[PDB]
């Protein structure tokens, strides 16, 4: 019972779901307990055909059938989930719910300043998804193109992702934070055709530069046609390049509201999104379609517990992989509406998560602890002042929760009355890799519980490279066996893909995390084992940013390193141009 | 009985169909009696997804199912026929029916002068639609190109229209008759990747200038990269631009006969067609191609024994849709008329009738007023007793040609169907079906499947209810082969059709309807602006304005407005107040102008 | 009994098939007996749709079912199998293989040396062809293009083929015997965007230089955009131009070992394969995907009697049809092994067949008469060292196999206890036409028997141009009607296509070759009828060869043709008649000179056996040349040429007869 290898483990109660959360569930769960967790979780381990097979027809819409549900090695790095199908995210994601019902309610939109809040319908989505898409086929995107999104967290960013997987071209999105150079190492690297960006964003009250950035780097991406500029701000001063430059409303005008989507391969690109990585510049890591489609709807479904009349709000940025799956595919596959937050947790003050939450009634919201240690500790007293009785689930992302802020995040947002699902995934997975599920997982506090469906989690011995049996046990964290919505490679870089994930262990999936393994077997992140730091949520590179020092020339040696900081859990100006101000 | 309001009907005796059109008609009809066609076409309206889904599947086949019949509305502009099914335009014309008889005649071509005339069997037809096909794909053309033709009414314009479909790519055809500029700004437009035209055509004996034309206008058309020449005349002056021009019978000649055809989307444009600054109203394939099977069956009385001639050019949209889609769909011959009625005789059409005994025959009431005024005693030279159905389009055809193309041509025994539509419908809207509607002479009688038609008050904008009754003619509910917009100008297609009066297609025609539901069309409207809901007389604003003595002349005009949809720009601080206090005592007060070629100024 | 026209066929005694090739084969046959097999043809005949749509839904996995069995006609040339339907040739061959057995092996490649082989698994064969494709695929390679393969017979031919063929595109492939000017216009017909090749080849254990050619040639070759280059001997003194050339390892090595396989129609070409004719240019036979894909594996399996169980070795080059056919499509397609010899029979010694038989216990063997003379003349005693027991079924192809070799090949490599098929076909149709099935059909040595699935063959009268009725008869071979794999096109020049085959005799395929049928049916090859020499099975363009010597300056004209050689079946030889010269002591080094010239021009196979130096080639009042006249004067029939007063210079003719006795043997 008492663990002299895992620490974090002694001493603590399981924490049973509030009887709150399954007043508060619309329909019967979508598992009854934690045994038949287990049986589902002990066939996708050893039956992933006759598990994922149905789930993948169940919930997605498909062009063509599968023959194959699983091909392919971690060792060899030819993994492919549901060879020879077809269908379209878009679709998926849009027109088979706008069909069903075009006005329930796609994208709660909530601006930097609640009075430009606005609600796109499943039907409106379609039609403005379609309009975009005409342009972008009107540009000569087609299949196969990369097209670069450079837009603020709010609608027209899912409508430039939504738009582009129409046409069957991937779309790579880029954090509204980074710098020129960011945005030209990106767009350079996946040779992007076009451009979705903005004239300028709203954050926190104060105008962002956004289509200047984008000018800054575009000088040095040539293989960029042609751009799309959203009017945010209608700053008539901001100039436009003649012949490449082109206004979203006046373009969108041109074309109807409806265009058939494009259908793409089980194992076709949905997108690419740009990591840091412990060595080498920024890498793109790519997403099959159907794999990362379904982990997103799969997880989204049993972790968090969502059912057609839930409201799910994500509060991340769709710059990173926590956005592409929780904000944007994963709600909408399933049919239910998400909240597009673009502005911060602190403007205009910091009851704003709460007021948009009492607004909409949403069941579900989803965080990173950094924003928790925030309004711990300047937004507490606002709280209590909207009502948060609509909430059921409660979930973490992105880094370690403490226990403390754990109870924090249960009793003070939560009321003692819903569950938390603390996830553990990368934007290598695609979607949770070991999270309790709502409902049915009791909880303790920091423990990410236990590993999900098609996820065979292991411990590795870091010096012997043997795995672990037995539980009371730490090492590296790494998965036995390949997950459909597991990333398939870097752009045109499969060595670097395979040196990384696949090499360092053969046989194996490695994390890059450390974690410890109790007598119940839930699982405890303890961090990563390579060079990366994460600060507030943020994956960065160290080499990347002695880099950026050692471009000053003033600068003879750089040494970075990542220490403990109660805000944001962990030459300046050079830093902050090669990279970006986070 | 009496009409009020309808004068055109009173006193016109109903005109049952003659016994010889059901004696004539090779199988039994495919409607039995005017309460059947009711039956069907209130589930038309009701239930279009039961009706018009089983006829899908029955007339086209599919190289991908659909999954929903129908999508959108008309307001938003969205509408979409059969979601998510894939098929070919020249699998549906040509392949299937050339596999089944490939020996059945398709195209019967009569040139402009006999001596040139022959017939393509649907073999023949997939053969040469193979091989142009091939021609314009190793030139790369491919799905989402345009291509356009420049071709005089002829089996080489069929070819070519059927050839561009099969690999996915959208046909812009231009008419003959169009002068340079009018090529270069319809090429333009569509940014056509590619040109089919032949050196020099022939009319009424007379040779013209088509090659010519081209190159003049080619100067200022960029896109083209290449020209595919056919040899109609083989005039060696001609001159091909080397690198750019080549010639069709070399090209084909080094291709085989089948090439496989290419699927595209339901909702993939089929064509686009420039109206007579022209616009280029874009057709879905699915539904495009469903309404002009599904008339041509229904309207005509057309089965696979029968001959269809109609005396139009692909040129316009009833080339397109009853010279060629139409009929091929079905797998009936048809017959492809490169001349004029009057050469080398005004007996032309009636010798071409008694040739090949055509059953069905398609013409406008122009060429009806020709021949009555200079060739009237010729009809009676030729035997015309293959004719059933005789069709009246594009115009209104007066109850004395009603009776004249009655007589003289339907010598009393045939059944006339006066065929209402437009460009943008893609087929019959109004229109009498042949063995089961009797017809008022001058009236087009009851609206077809899947058309749901009403008249509006023009400046109340509210339907009409009851008969005997005139008004503004609209269409309830979008239909398969409604056009989808305008080629990269979808803001004129929705302020053109569905923002005049919102929930409604407007035709931009007058119509009236009677105490039996016959309607009779009245003619073009005054087209009028719609400012917020008030509709205004652009021609009304001019005349008020000139009233004033101080106006030299006043131009009004309409342009979209992002407020009010529509707003008034008149060209003609003191006097403008005065001229608009002239306009709002003379029309009213919401008639005053927003502001005092033009629209393309106002609208930058 | 006795034939009046048909000689071969007298006092020929049917051979049955052993018994112990039953007992040897793996499971019951795929057919029963001989009468099974006449009611199966005579459906593929008269009832296509209902014999061939059920088999190829069977033997094919389809992306998109077809709803057309057969279209098209001959005389027409618009021919077309399965319309409709959509698959792809790559995943046929590996993909679901891998995924049934991905361990199962599929290419036994046994190199110029036997230390450098290997085996690649169907899971090996999916990950290096994804990977590649996936190359190619950054390239902007897409359906619809054309990539040309210059490559040894090994793994990495087999490995672009299937790569290119995975994307949708058509691949052309470059026999390495040929030089830099043949590459330069196969590679510029087809306009292809994109080159695999390798830096060096071994054959016989000499190093031949590959990259090397491929850059002389590529000076001229606009169309292609980069070249993927395989290092086989990792020479580092081989140049790779920059910004065209990238090594095969660098390039593969960023990309996954799973791409997916794009859909193709039935009739897409899935590749062009340049012949040679009665041209003087290489014309690019056009094959589709799903008709030519079941010929291969229909054939495979019902001629050469091919289980899951067996393994086959085609000692042939994917350069020429065999290979394509019968050692990558038709067996991988059956998802078999199939042995990938890049050597040649002779190194390390005559005995290297029958070591990579007994090696990898082979069960079929499919090889040209022209080695069998040679291992026949020099490697007899090599087969008593090797237990060649795991044969069944012995193919001959390319080239009439006279009633000696094929007992021959009978006794010592059969043992006696195996079947012989001897194969008749040709590059444009695809697959098998007329061939003894295994366990099935007595063979008549030196006969090809019956006519194979789909295949209505006719005689036809050549005075008359009328099908001959009734058996014991001779004429031009034809075929009545179009089968699945026959070739569709020559690329972009129909017309050739349609007077070269179908024109010539309206309503039928004219296979160039004359035939003769026996009284029990038994069809009996009697060669060429247009004049094509084929020497130790490579086709050959006899007016080809004409052109290079002409290219020489010196040559005032050539005239080129075909004789029997007891080596190479066949021989060119070649007439030369020099501008300026009638210098005697040049004789023997302008000889060498004209060979060489052949040898760069178009590559060493094709340099003739003998130069005849003459003063004036035999001509007529036109002033064509008269090559009857040099044929039957190399063929020692002097005699038998008639009246010559037709000729405008008669007396030429005694110089060419004297030219021929002087120069031939020396
Ligand atoms: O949340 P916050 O209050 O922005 O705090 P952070 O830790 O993210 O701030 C780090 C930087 O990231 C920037 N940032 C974070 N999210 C951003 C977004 N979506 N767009 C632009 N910049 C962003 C902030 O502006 C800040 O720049 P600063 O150093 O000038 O303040
Ligand atoms: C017995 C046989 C193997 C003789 O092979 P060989 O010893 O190479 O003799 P060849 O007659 O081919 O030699 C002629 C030239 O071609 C060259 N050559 C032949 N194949 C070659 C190849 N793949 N790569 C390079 N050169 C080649 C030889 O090197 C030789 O050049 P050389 O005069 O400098 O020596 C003969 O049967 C053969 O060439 N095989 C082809 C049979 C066949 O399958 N035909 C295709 C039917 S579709
Ligand atoms: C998600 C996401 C965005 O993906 P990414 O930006 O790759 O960051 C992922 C990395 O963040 C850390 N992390 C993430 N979730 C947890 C958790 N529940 N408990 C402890 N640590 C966690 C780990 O180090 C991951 O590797
Ligand atoms: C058709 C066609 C070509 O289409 P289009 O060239 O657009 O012309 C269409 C216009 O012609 C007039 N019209 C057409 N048919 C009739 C008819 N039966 N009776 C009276 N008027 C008719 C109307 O004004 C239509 O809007
Ligand atoms: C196959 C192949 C090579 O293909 P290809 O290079 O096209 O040459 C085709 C010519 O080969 C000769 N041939 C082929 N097989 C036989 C045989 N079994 N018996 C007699 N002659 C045969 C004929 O002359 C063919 O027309
Ligand atoms: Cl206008
Ligand atoms: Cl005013």
Same mark, same amino acid.
């Given at each position: ?14 924490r ?9 569930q ?10 038949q967790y287990?049986?589902?979780? =002990?066939?996708?381990?050893?039956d ?54 075009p006005?329930?309610?796609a994208?709660?939109? =909530? ?13 409106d989505?379609?039609? =403005?998804?379609?309009?975009?898409a005409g ?16 837009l ?24 509204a934070?980074?710098?020129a150079?960011?945005i ?49 701000t ?6 436009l ?19 058939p ?9 949905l ?17 099959s ?12 479904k ?7 009349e ?46 948009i ?23 507490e ?9 609509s ?22 947002v939560?009321?003692?009355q ?18 309790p599920?709502a ?27 043997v795995?672990?049996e ?28 395979m ?26 992140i ?15 590179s ?14 003879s ?9 109660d ?5 300046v ?10």
């Amino acid at each position: 019972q008492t663990h002299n290898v895992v620490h974090e483990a002694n001493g603590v109660k399981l924490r049973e779901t509030p009887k709150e959360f399954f007043e508060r569930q619309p329909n019967k769960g979508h598992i009854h307990d934690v045994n038949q967790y287990k049986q589902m979780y =002990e066939q996708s381990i050893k039956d992933p055909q006759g598990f994922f097979g149905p789930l993948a027809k169940e919930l997605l819409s498909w062009d063509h059938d599968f023959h194959t549900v699983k091909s392919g090695t971690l060792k060899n790095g030819d993994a492919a989930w549901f060879l020879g199908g077809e269908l379209n995210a878009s679709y998926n994601c849009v027109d088979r719910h706008a069909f069903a019902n075009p006005d329930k309610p796609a994208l709660i939109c =909530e601006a930097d300043d609640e009075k430009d809040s606005h609600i796109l319908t499943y039907g409106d989505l379609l039609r =403005e998804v379609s309009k975009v898409a005409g342009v972008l086929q009107s540009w000569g995107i087609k299949k196969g193109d990369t097209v670069a999104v450079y837009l603020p967290m709010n609608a027209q960013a899912i409508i430039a992702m939504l738009a582009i997987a129409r046409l069957g071209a991937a779309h790579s999105v880029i954090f509204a934070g980074f710098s020129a150079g960011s945005i030209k190492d990106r767009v350079n690297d996946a040779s992007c055709k076009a451009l979705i960006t903005c004239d300028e964003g709203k954050r926190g009250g104060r105008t962002t530069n956004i289509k200047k950035l984008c000018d800054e780097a575009l000088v040095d991406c040539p293989t960029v046609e042609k751009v799309l500029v959203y009017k945010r701000t209608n700053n008539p001063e901001i100039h436009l390049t003649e012949g490449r430059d082109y206004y979203w409303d006046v373009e969108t005008a041109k074309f109807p509201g409806y265009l058939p989507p494009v259908s793409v391969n089980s194992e076709d690109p949905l997108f690419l999104l740009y990591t840091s990585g412990s060595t080498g510049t920024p890498k793109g890591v790519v997403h099959s379609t159907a794999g990362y489609l379904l982990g997103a709807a799969l997880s989204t479904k049993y972790i968090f517990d969502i059912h057609p009349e839930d409201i799910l709000f994500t509060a991340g940025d769709v710059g990173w992989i926590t956005g592409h799956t929780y904000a944007l595919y994963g709600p909408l596959l399933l049919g239910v509406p998400t909240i597009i937050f673009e502005g911060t947790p602190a403007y205009p003050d910091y009851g704003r998560f709460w007021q948009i939450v009492e607004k909409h009634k949403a069941t579900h919201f989803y965080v990173a602890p950094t924003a928790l240690r925030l309004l711990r500790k300047a937004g507490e007293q606002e709280i209590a002042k909207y009502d948060l009785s609509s909430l059921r689930t409660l979930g973490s992302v992105g880094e370690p929760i403490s226990p403390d802020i754990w109870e924090w995040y249960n009793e003070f947002v939560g009321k003692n009355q819903c569950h938390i699902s603390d996830t553990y995934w990368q934007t290598e997975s695609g979607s949770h890799l070991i999270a309790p599920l709502a409902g049915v997982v009791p909880n303790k506090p920091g423990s990410a519980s236990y590993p999900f469906f098609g996820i065979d989690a292991a411990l590795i011995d870091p010096v012997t490279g043997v795995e672990i049996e037995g539980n009371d046990a730490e090492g590296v964290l790494a998965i036995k066996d390949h997950w459909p919505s597991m990333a398939r490679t870097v752009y045109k870089n499969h060595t670097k893909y395979m040196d990384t994930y696949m090499n360092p262990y053969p046989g194996y999936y490695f994390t890059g995390d450390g974690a410890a393994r109790d007598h119940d077997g839930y699982y405890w992140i303890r961090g990563r084992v390579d060079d990366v730091v994460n600060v507030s949520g943020h994956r960065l590179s160290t080499a990347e940013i002695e880099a950026a020092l050692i471009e000053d020339k003033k600068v003879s040696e750089a040494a970075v390193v990542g220490i403990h900081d109660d805000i944001t859990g962990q030459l300046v100006l050079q830093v902050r141009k090669t990279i970006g101000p986070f």
